Amino acid sequence: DDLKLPRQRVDLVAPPFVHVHEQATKQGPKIMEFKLVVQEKKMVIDEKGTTFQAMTFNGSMPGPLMVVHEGDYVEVTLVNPATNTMPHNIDFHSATGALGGGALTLINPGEQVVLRWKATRTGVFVYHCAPGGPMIPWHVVSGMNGAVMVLPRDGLNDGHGHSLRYDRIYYIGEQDLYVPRDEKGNFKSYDSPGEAYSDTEEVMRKLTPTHVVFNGKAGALTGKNALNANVGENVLIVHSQANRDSRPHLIGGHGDYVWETGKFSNAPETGLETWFIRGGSAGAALYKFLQPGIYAYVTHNLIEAANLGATAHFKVEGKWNDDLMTQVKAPADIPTGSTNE
Amino acid sequence: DDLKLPRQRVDLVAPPFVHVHEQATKQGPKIMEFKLVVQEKKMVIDEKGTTFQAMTFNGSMPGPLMVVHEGDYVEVTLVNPATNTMPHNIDFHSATGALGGGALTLINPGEQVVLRWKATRTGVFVYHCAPGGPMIPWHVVSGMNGAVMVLPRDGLNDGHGHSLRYDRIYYIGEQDLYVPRDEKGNFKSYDSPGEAYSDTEEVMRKLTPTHVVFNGKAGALTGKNALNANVGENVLIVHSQANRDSRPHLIGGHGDYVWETGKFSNAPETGLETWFIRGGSAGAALYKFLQPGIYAYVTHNLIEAANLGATAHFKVEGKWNDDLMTQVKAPADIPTGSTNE
Amino acid sequence: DDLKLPRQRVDLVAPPFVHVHEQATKQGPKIMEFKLVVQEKKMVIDEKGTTFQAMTFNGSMPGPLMVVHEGDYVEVTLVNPATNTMPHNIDFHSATGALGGGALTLINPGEQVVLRWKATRTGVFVYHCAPGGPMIPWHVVSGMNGAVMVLPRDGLNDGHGHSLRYDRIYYIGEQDLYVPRDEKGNFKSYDSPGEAYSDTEEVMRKLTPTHVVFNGKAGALTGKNALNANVGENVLIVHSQANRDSRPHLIGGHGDYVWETGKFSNAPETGLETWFIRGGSAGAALYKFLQPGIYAYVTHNLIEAANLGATAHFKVEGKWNDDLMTQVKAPADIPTGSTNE
Ligand SMILES: [Cu+2]
Ligand SMILES: [Cu+2]
Ligand SMILES: [Cu+2]
Ligand SMILES: [Cu+2]
Ligand SMILES: [Cu+2]
Ligand SMILES: [Cu+2]
């Protein structure tokens, strides 16, 4: 029985940016058409140049953020070009049935498949590859995961009948990586994903990542690729982790409204310091910037953040508010008449 | 001052099934009588046949689910037969005082004890052995844990004054295990729990399980022992973890109503993808099945799920709903006129 | 533009105790003045006498609890005496801007600095040192963390318009420690924090603590330093963890009202068995004691609690309530006419 709705093709963009979309809409349901192309490739994952045999949707870690509204249909063309070596598929945590779509999307190199799922559940959700058995964790921790956001047609709200609107949106995908080391402790390089598998599985079994990165590599979202904002902007930060828990924190800020389980049928929590993304989920936080300067966005296992790669920066333009915070006295020698014991 | 209420003896059943009970009741408070018999025994824990020196309530990992109503008294006879080697006791997280009952239930082999506790707190709760000191974690991670559910007398509700009723209930106990390996990496076998202790404690101290299993072994709830359901059934899934965090996910489904901290005085969250069972707790999720087929129920550390044992299956009978999900085009060769870069 | 409010100097006290304060107040906003003095020193961290090169605020792990009200200004003098070897600073998760104050408070040995921040967000919050880069996790896991509580001016409430008042307050700071071992497995000793750094960073990178302690050492809050209470008292337990998740549980009790994300703009959850402190946060639980005796307060990874140091005790005076719990029959030989199979 053919589905007779308007069709809209969406052009995906690389994270941490997001394709153009409406928050609130008075459009009715549409068939929203997306294409994802699997790419297996070697990628650089840290500031010392360590390489890694990655597997990706659309060439990025994370895969791109897809944005639709409640009641839309999502028609995904998944493509596995013949230059790839492995079968792949896709599981949407937003979707109902057939292992999230994985049981309908297994494609060999040289094949494509078209899946349609109805967006009946609001929130941010993980999507990931899941070919079967031990291949499931391996494909996910090799980079084959992203997220989808299903907005209410009226946009976000505070759970108390007040509209919330973001000025800007970023998608932070966090990736735990398991890179083998040689006897001297140096990271090993491989010529293919298959050649890396046996040694990688041994690291995976001990459940301790070697790297924890945002946007696919240590330092990806620092320096020139810091995330921009302005004082007064309400920024939505979508965070996903397909395999392992995370505890996001905006250093110098807060989560004004946080959906840490990521589902917009639930009222957000207010005024959080640190929130929790359970492995296998996406969450989202709104924050209105009140001060200019550098902010560090981390997982608040600080060892992970500083030493394994999991720090992003915001660079925020505007005027400093000395009422909220001020340096009353700059660093100075301790007065000779001081005690301090 | 004798307690003059009606008495009701309950026959426990092995997980993942649950003894017969009423959801809503107009019976008044009763003294609900349960018996738990400690059994120390070697058990098989994985598909390669690895054995393990287990310690159990009633011969199973997890121990059986006990179900009562708010205001009931729970009178537990704990039995430690003389074939066992160790003292044991029981701590109910549902109970008030004396370390949950552990300080009133320490029994040597050849002894039994009778504890009564009032079910003043609604929810699902862990129970576990806790003899003292380093024996506490060792007995728990050797299998001595289960759960109890204290229903409201009116049954479950959505926290917004609507009744919720399940058609079916399953109890998923998740167990982290710490099995020693020899120099070549093979799992070691022992002739008694005491002989296994020193080597096991060394693995425990590094806080990384060798196995993470549902119902006591890898594959316990797959194949012929898959969990049955039907399209349209509302299924309650109780999940416990006495020692370590878990992140349950129903692959191809959702949590319609989830009490992730497990306590029915709190409204459930709606429409979750993945929830979080904090170590030392039980939680519960309702889901109404909408699609037939195989579902995988996992902890969404996919390494744990696929490679350390933590996958169950549901086999769901009914009619496929192509409105919720459909394969628009089956796998096919990528069209020669395609780009895809 | 000078801030013309009354000033009040607060004398901090060592955890787990808390400086005197009012819960509800009709005082207007004040400038609340605190002093923190960094102390680097060797400390004993376990019952076998293992030493550790610690770095502290005010000589304690955790640093002391600071208590203010919503709308107060907090003026902190941070002092780094010239006997210390390292630069230090302070980041308040309660504060807005400049990395929580860290970007305005970096002081060398022999210097002090004065920071003022407005307490615009209610809750319990972590504070910690964060000098920059890999020094951030190292200073935090060396002991440089504490907490601040920002009460509503009307005191706590249940989120349903009922006042909650505590009779007693304790602050439990949990610390994950990473102590190097020699080839034979013995803990290594060092003559300075700098000498310990390289070996410590190697342990930190594997993300598995050697010790998990409350109030700075295994057994700190047991024996003669058990926490006192009485039957009928409502006790607030503030719990912080600056780097790593925790799952608090009061053995033999409950959390009557729990703010596990720690922020008093959110209604507490009721009747919890175990709650969850995400690393990089503080939470709080109220409990009204109903039974006398010993209670153990743990993180409910029982391996951490029993074997790595993370157990406190409450000693509760009062009368036992046999309605809530009773030993119906003391331990006795299993009757000869018993079955039990
Ligand atoms: Cu794949
Ligand atoms: Cu998944
Ligand atoms: Cu036992
Ligand atoms: Cu317990
Ligand atoms: Cu410091
Ligand atoms: Cu911090």
Short mmCIF file of N, CA, C and O and ligand atoms in Angstrom, two decimals, chain A residues 38 55 57 86-89 129-131 139 144, ligand 1:
data_model
loop_
_atom_site.label_atom_id
_atom_site.label_comp_id
_atom_site.label_asym_id
_atom_site.label_seq_id
_atom_site.Cartn_x
_atom_site.Cartn_y
_atom_site.Cartn_z
N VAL A 38 29.20 3.99 3.19
CA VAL A 38 30.24 3.44 4.07
C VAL A 38 31.59 3.73 3.48
O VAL A 38 31.80 3.45 2.25
N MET A 55 36.36 2.53 10.13
CA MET A 55 35.21 2.22 9.28
C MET A 55 34.14 3.26 9.62
O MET A 55 33.89 3.51 10.84
N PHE A 57 30.53 5.87 8.43
CA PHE A 57 29.43 6.34 7.58
C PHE A 57 29.80 7.72 7.07
O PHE A 57 30.10 8.65 7.87
N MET A 86 34.32 -5.38 3.67
CA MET A 86 33.45 -6.01 4.71
C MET A 86 31.99 -5.78 4.33
O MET A 86 31.69 -4.72 3.82
N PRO A 87 31.08 -6.67 4.73
CA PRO A 87 29.68 -6.31 4.79
C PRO A 87 29.39 -5.31 5.93
O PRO A 87 30.11 -5.28 6.94
N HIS A 88 28.36 -4.51 5.73
CA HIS A 88 27.93 -3.47 6.70
C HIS A 88 26.42 -3.45 6.72
O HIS A 88 25.76 -3.92 5.76
N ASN A 89 25.83 -2.79 7.71
CA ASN A 89 24.38 -2.57 7.77
C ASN A 89 24.14 -1.33 8.64
O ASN A 89 25.09 -0.62 8.99
N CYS A 129 26.39 0.56 12.85
CA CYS A 129 26.50 -0.70 12.11
C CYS A 129 26.39 -1.84 13.11
O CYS A 129 26.82 -1.70 14.28
N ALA A 130 25.90 -2.99 12.70
CA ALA A 130 25.78 -4.15 13.60
C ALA A 130 25.66 -5.42 12.78
O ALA A 130 24.57 -6.04 12.74
N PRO A 131 26.75 -5.84 12.11
CA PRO A 131 26.64 -6.94 11.12
C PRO A 131 26.22 -8.28 11.71
O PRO A 131 25.68 -9.11 10.97
N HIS A 139 32.75 -3.19 14.55
CA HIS A 139 32.37 -2.12 13.59
C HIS A 139 32.06 -0.84 14.34
O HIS A 139 32.42 0.27 13.85
N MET A 144 31.78 3.19 13.25
CA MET A 144 30.51 3.12 12.49
C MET A 144 29.33 3.44 13.39
O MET A 144 28.56 2.56 13.76
CU CU D 1 30.08 -1.94 9.45
#
